[PDB]
Nucleic acid binder design. Structure first.
Ligand SMILES: [K+]
Ligand SMILES: [K+]
Ligand SMILES: [K+]
Ligand SMILES: [Mg+2]
Ligand SMILES: [Mg+2]
Ligand SMILES: [Mg+2]
Ligand SMILES: [Mg+2]
Ligand SMILES: [Mg+2]
Ligand SMILES: [Mg+2]
Ligand SMILES: [Mg+2]
Ligand SMILES: [Mg+2]
Ligand SMILES: [Mg+2]
Ligand SMILES: [Mg+2]
Ligand SMILES: [Mg+2]
Ligand SMILES: [Mg+2]
Ligand SMILES: [Mg+2]
Ligand SMILES: [Mg+2]
Ligand SMILES: [Mg+2]
Ligand SMILES: [Mg+2]
Ligand SMILES: [Mg+2]
Ligand SMILES: [Mg+2]
Ligand SMILES: [Mg+2]
Ligand SMILES: [Mg+2]
Ligand SMILES: [Mg+2]
Ligand SMILES: [Mg+2]
Ligand SMILES: [Mg+2]
Ligand SMILES: [Mg+2]
Ligand SMILES: [Mg+2]
Ligand SMILES: [Mg+2]
Ligand SMILES: [Mg+2]
Ligand SMILES: [Mg+2]
Ligand SMILES: [Mg+2]
Ligand code: NA
Lengths: 50, 120, 160, 151
RNA sequence: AAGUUUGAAAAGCACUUUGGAAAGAGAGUGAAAUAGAACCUGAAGUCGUGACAAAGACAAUGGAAGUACCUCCAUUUCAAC
RNA sequence: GAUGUGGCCUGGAGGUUAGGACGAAGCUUAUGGCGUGAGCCUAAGAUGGACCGGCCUCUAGUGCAGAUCUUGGUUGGCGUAGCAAAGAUCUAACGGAGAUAUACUCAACAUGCAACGUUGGAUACUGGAGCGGGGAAGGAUUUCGUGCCAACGGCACUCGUA
RNA sequence: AACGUGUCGCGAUGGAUGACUUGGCUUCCUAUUUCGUUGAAGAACGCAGUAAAGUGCGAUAAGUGGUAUCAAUUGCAGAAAUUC
């Protein structure tokens, strides 16, 4: 599964570059479900994106 | 007066004819009984007319006209049909000059046309 | 008069390793530099384009025209020449065939057909009718689609 | 619609592909080597060519290609390992085997009796040369037809 | 640049099977499917394939005369001929 | 170079004779016959599917091997020259039809190779006169999401300014 | 041997030829035939249930009104005989 959208949204939300964003290598289905900024914020809260 | 000396002009007038000229061109002969009782030899076909195929594969087939397409120069008859590959039934088009009108769908305007046409 | 020449074609000259025929100028199309104006070029002008002041008509001496008509009339009286032309005059009573003037009084084509059958001119008419067919070649599309032989010529004293 | 007719139609299986998009010359070499083979031996050959332990002998389209020791089994000195043509021909052989099985024949008894590779209609691209020249950059697809007969 | 000129009529290939699909193999419509879609005919040139003829290097082609082998071709004979 | 030819051939027109769905023109030929020849005619198409032949005369945009001829197509060269500036990729997992794809003999190697996207790790480069952020000119939907891989991104693609 | 060379049969590529032409070119004729500030010709935008181009039309927009016709249009959908 491609997580380009989730990575870009996480970069914009966290205010850092793509190199600073960590998407869990697990939780790929959980991350790929997120398709909005609020969903990515929920993922960041849960710790699946750091 | 489509036919003329110039074949190019006659064909152009035929195949670019308007809808009403196409209606006149798509006439079918009346039956002998209808010729006897109306003194008219042919009439433009109409929806709900009863016709019988005289020429082609479907010769002898009798049915009621469901459509006078006038864009494909054909009339659709209910009894004339074939099945597709799916098995569904589709209407086979017939040129009106290959059929014969056995019963007329009569309206006041068509009655006036018949009175205009009759040779008596 | 403009049929092969509605282009701004110019020759490229020597040094370009192509033939010196004039070529269509400009670019962006398939005709760019495609050769032009020549009778040997695809879209070019024909050799010696035809004119309307060609001598279409002829003037014939009046005496020669009268001589020709007189000769044709004299030949129409010889049954051998009539047969050799292709007419069927086997049952014709006489050549030249002269009939009564009452045939002008006919008003129905049926009476004319009966007269033709009686005077035995019907064989040539049948020959013409059986000879009808579709013309071979381009004239089929040039308003001369049907051809047929020539039958008897009926001559009247007047226009009636 | 094949150029040749099988000896016994009920004992044969046919397979065809049009506009393959593999190179016509490489496919010509690859498919020609299995003409006359049993189906299983041809499939083993294609697998071993993919493994690079045997080569496809290049004849008639081997101009200035390299020499190899694996061409000796074919009586040649020049051969290659064209993988795109090999996988396309493997798919075609699978289709022929499926047709043979559906007809009711034994795929282990089939012998390839006919192979024909023909050039298809070409596809046009461009390359850009020095001094502002545009020059054709063409693709040469192929048609491949075959049938195999039970022995 | 370009005729959408399939067919009388879309009747424009249902369905089965292999294939990720494109397609293939069957089946079917049609008088015809090398009439399957910008599809009437379908040439030349070039190429593939099967069968056969052979053939050193005389570039090949070519002439003239034979012969070997072939020939879905043209004639003539088959009996007091 | 001149001239002659009941000399050959082509598209039309007057005539005249025929032919065609039991197959017309076109097309094909180890397919024969006739003619010194230009050519003509027959045969066969397991070709075609609707026109057309002979003869007399009239008429012309009437015959190709070459013009660095015109247009279209093809073609050997040739799977050849090459696709070498801007340092670079590796690894696991997941995804994908793209695999770990096998007739028998059979442990696996010696018979499915190679290639994709994403994420995590590793390694590197740009090195602030940046393959960083924003604008003008120019462009005008290339922006975004989903799907999608025929053609295009001169290798590849599951990726894409397609 | 293999490359390669022929010949024949069948395929492919390629679209010549022949048939067919709602086109062009040429000639001839007819007439209460000659645009516009009462805004022309040309440009540009838009309009259909579905509509890119083209055609037609102009916010009344693939047309309103009237007169003739006499039952369609047509890819699908929608609507459905005496002027209405
Ligand atoms: K009729
Ligand atoms: K050819
Ligand atoms: K010889
Ligand atoms: Mg009448
Ligand atoms: Mg011209
Ligand atoms: Mg002709
Ligand atoms: Mg080299
Ligand atoms: Mg080499
Ligand atoms: Mg270049
Ligand atoms: Mg440049
Ligand atoms: Mg053109
Ligand atoms: Mg049948
Ligand atoms: Mg055929
Ligand atoms: Mg064809
Ligand atoms: Mg001389
Ligand atoms: Mg001419
Ligand atoms: Mg030959
Ligand atoms: Mg000329
Ligand atoms: Mg020529
Ligand atoms: Mg080449
Ligand atoms: Mg190289
Ligand atoms: Mg390299
Ligand atoms: Mg280089
Ligand atoms: Mg480099
Ligand atoms: Mg692998
Ligand atoms: Mg570093
Ligand atoms: Mg550096
Ligand atoms: Mg550095
Ligand atoms: Mg910068
Ligand atoms: Mg590429
Ligand atoms: Mg529009
Ligand atoms: Mg208004
Ligand atoms: Na051949």
């Amino acid at each position: 599964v491609s997580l380009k959208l989730q990575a870009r949204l996480a970069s914009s939300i966290l205010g850092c570059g793509r190199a600073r964003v960590w998407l869990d290598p697990n939780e790929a289905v959980e991350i790929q479900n997120a398709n909005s900024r609020k969903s990515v914020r929920k993922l960041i809260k849960d710790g699946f994106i750091i | 007066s489509i036919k003329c000396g110039s074949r190019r002009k006659a064909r152009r007038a035929h195949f670019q004819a308007p809808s009403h000229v196409r209606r006149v061109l798509m006439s079918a002969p009346l039956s002998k009984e209808l010729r006897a009782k109306y003194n008219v030899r042919a009439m433009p076909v109409r929806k709900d007319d009863e016709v019988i195929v005289k020429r082609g594969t479907f010769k002898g087939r009798e049915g009621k006209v469901t459509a006078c397409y006038r864009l494909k120069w054909v009339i659709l008859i209910d009894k004339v049909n074939r099945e597709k590959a799916n098995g569904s039934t589709v209407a086979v088009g017939i040129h009106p000059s290959n059929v014969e009108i056995t019963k007329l769908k009569l309206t006041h305007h068509r009655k006036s046309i018949l009175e205009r046409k009759d040779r008596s | 008069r403009l049929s092969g020449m509605n282009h701004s074609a110019h020759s490229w000259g020597t040094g370009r390793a192509v033939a010196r025929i004039p070529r269509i100028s400009g670019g962006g199309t398939s005709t760019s530099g495609a050769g032009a104006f020549g009778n040997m070029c695809r879209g070019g002008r024909m050799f010696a384009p035809t004119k309307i002041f060609r001598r279409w008509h002829r003037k014939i001496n009046l005496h020669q025209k009268r001589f020709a008509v007189v000769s044709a009339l004299a030949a129409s009286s010889v049954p051998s020449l009539v047969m050799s032309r292709g007419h069927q005059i086997g049952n014709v009573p006489e050549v030249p065939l002269v009939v009564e003037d009452s045939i002008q009084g006919y008003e129905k084509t049926k009476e004319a057909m009966a007269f033709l059958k009686a005077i035995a001119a019907i064989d040539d008419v049948n020959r013409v009718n059986d000879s009808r067919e579709i013309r071979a070649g381009r004239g089929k599309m040039r308003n001369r689609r049907y051809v047929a032989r020539r039958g008897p010529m009926l001559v009247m004293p007047n226009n009636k | 619609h094949y150029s040749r007719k099988p000896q016994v139609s009920s004992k044969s299986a046919k397979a065809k592909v049009s506009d393959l998009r593999c190179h016509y010359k490489n496919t010509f070499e690859t498919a020609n080597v299995i003409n006359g083979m049993p189906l299983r031996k041809a499939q083993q050959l294609y697998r071993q060519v993919l493994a690079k332990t045997r080569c496809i002998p290049f004849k008639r389209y081997n101009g200035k290609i390299g020499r190899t020791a694996q061409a000796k089994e074919w009586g040649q000195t020049k051969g290659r390992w064209p993988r795109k043509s090999v996988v396309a021909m493997m798919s075609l052989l699978k289709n022929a085997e499926a047709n043979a099985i559906e007809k009711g024949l034994d795929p282990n008894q089939m012998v390839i009796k006919h192979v024909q590779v023909d050039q298809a209609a070409r596809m046009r691209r461009r390359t850009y040369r020095a001094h502002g020249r545009i020059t054709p950059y063409m693709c040469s697809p192929c048609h491949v037809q075959l049938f195999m007969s039970e022995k």
